[PDB]
Design a protein around this nucleic acid. Structure first.
Lengths: 183, 182, 182, 183
DNA sequence: TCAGTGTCCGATAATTTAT
DNA sequence: TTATCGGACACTG
DNA sequence: TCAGTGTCCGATAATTTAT
DNA sequence: TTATCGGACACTG
DNA sequence: TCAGTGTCCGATAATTTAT
DNA sequence: TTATCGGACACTG
DNA sequence: TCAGTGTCCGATAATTTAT
DNA sequence: TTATCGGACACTG
């Protein structure tokens, strides 16, 4: 009975296609999938909240890998428990377990917290390797896309600030920031 | 600061045997907290108290890990709270603290594999019982009143009230006895 | 073909309570095997037998998983043997068989986390004992002979042999008694 | 006291350099490392057998990740047990555990068999994705590096077979194989 | 003193499949 | 997994 | 011929710590 | 682990 | 009827670090 | 994490 | 004023299955 | 889980 597929992304890319094509592949219907994209912190995975609602006693959700049904373990279990309360299991295709039975769920918890700990360590590296470049004089973030030499030229040549922002189609504040910064 | 939390769910006084295990692990009595649990989830008021009277640099001891939580989802919440509060929990018998970031992993595995085996017991108990039940095993409180007496009075045609007075027993009982034994 | 292996290491007859658990799980007595273990690692001769009398398509039942192996390294060898022999093991109480390829994983985790807790008990027992020992607890067999008797004879100057004859006790004992109680 | 580093490879490449530079990095001495390369099935990881021998009670071995101290779990434990018998622990740098104590070893066993099961599944895919290409008419293995059209030309033009292999500096058998195959 | 022919095979080489 | 090198081994001149 | 003294030790039974 | 048991062994009378 | 100036800030954009 | 856009908000003409 | 009949039920105590 | 207890409630005399 009823077979629903969930998918997700966080790489902020079209990585999405491979996932959904694995669901449909393993016998899902296009009219039974739901997806969520990464917006930021608050991003309340809207689609999933809907999923919860249109599934009934004797359904199964398919998920590609594990870390697609929510981020950290705490959520993962609650999330699972929510489903198990409506009477619904989850197959994880690649990882091979199912929220089908007692013994499974455990494996999901174990398997989870193995990584949520393996995660916390990749950071400690990705971070350290980030900071090491910082003090080594590496430039971070968005590239200065304004001709700042050209705007310093305006103010020094005593002229109204708003007028300036009206001549390059830019924000007013920015012009104040630019100069209030570079003196 | 050295704190000890304890718990007992058998509705027993096994508490005094657990609290010693920490009293002997260095914890002073002013800094121990307990909980009798007897029907709900809000009965962790003794912990509710601890959960506040602690500060950064403290450590709380618990005998076995399965006393602190219940289901692993409660477990992690409990850890997590204390965690970013700045306290650590150390499990005496089991031999882990949440000190290391890798402690936490164990603390989760170690339990979700218990919580598995715990749920198995339940499933395996109900059936073990249900089995016994049908096989002929009498249940609950032992019948204590001499029932063959009360019936005798009634079959001898005697108003109910009288009967409950001449054995100093409850009237409902009389009625129950005879309402049941027919 | 439905096979059941069993084991008991307490040096007890708890065997008959385990063997029933499979006799009642469908296994016929012709197809059950046991082992008393009492001092070595070669005493799995009852399994040595099973390990051969089985073929492809069979299944062996075991009550709890920790009866089949000892340390997890033995566990996996045992599984592995049966595995590429074509038989499967199903753990009654625990509720896993080595049937699925993912069963095997559990069977390993499930145990290495036991084998942990098992080793902890040992460490925690030795100390619990050693503790008691020094605190004043007498150990081993209870002294049964009336020692105050034997000494009386000797302090009364009586050849040892006589003494062991007039209580029908061992001569070494006499000597031991008096060699000890001075 | 004494700190020994083990490293290993199997990708049959110079992947080796990154590993050893992580050992030396985490405080090892060049004169305390040992390495093994992948030869095939029998490859008895010679270096490691030597390692076992020159370490004593109160040493520690460093290993980059986990799957470098032997392949499958069964070995992994035996291997470990061998060391623990001489009284020697193992730190695994990236994975973060140590054969230091009871509770660790377990984690190593768990952590191991999680993957040795996750391994067995990658195969089932890498295999299926291999076979799918097979029937789809994909050509497998070593490329035919002989001018076979030129050797068929020799035999059909009735000439001694050995002579042939003496004119292209090739193996005799090959010439028989070539023709005994392509007719 | 070897001399060439036709099989069958372990050992290396060069490739390919998907994480 | 498929392609080549070297050879050992049985015949036959 | 056989009787006793005293030290040691392998083979059982008895008991214990802790779940 | 300790207790008790037969029973071997080396001297002694 | 707005009219321009100088701060301080949430929301998006475009980047970078190492598995 | 750093750069830009839009604005709301307090003054001042 | 007050006495009895009979049904229900919340509040304790008593007991049990299984480790 | 069942047993026993006081004690409320609706009728009845």
């Amino acid at each position: 009975m009823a077979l629903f597929g969930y998918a997700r992304v966080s790489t902020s890319q079209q990585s999405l296609d491979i996932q959904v094509r694995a669901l449909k592949d393993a016998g899902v219907k296009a009219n039974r999938i739901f997806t969520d994209k990464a917006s930021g912190s608050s991003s309340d995975r809207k689609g999933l909240d809907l999923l919860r609602m249109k599934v009934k006693e004797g359904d199964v959700i398919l998920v590609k890998k594990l870390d697609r049904l929510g981020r950290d373990t705490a959520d993962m279990i609650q999330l699972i428990k929510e489903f198990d309360a409506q009477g619904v299991s989850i197959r994880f295709i690649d990882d091979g377990i199912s929220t089908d039975s007692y013994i499974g769920k455990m494996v999901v918890t174990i398997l989870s917290a193995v990584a949520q700990a393996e995660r916390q360590r990749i950071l400690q590296r990705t971070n350290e390797g980030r900071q090491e470049a910082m003090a080594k004089g590496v430039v971070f973030g968005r590239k200065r896309k304004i001709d700042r030499d050209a705007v310093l030229n305006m103010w020094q040549q005593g002229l109204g600030a708003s007028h300036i922002s009206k001549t390059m189609n830019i924000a007013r504040s920015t012009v104040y920031k630019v100069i209030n910064e570079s003196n």
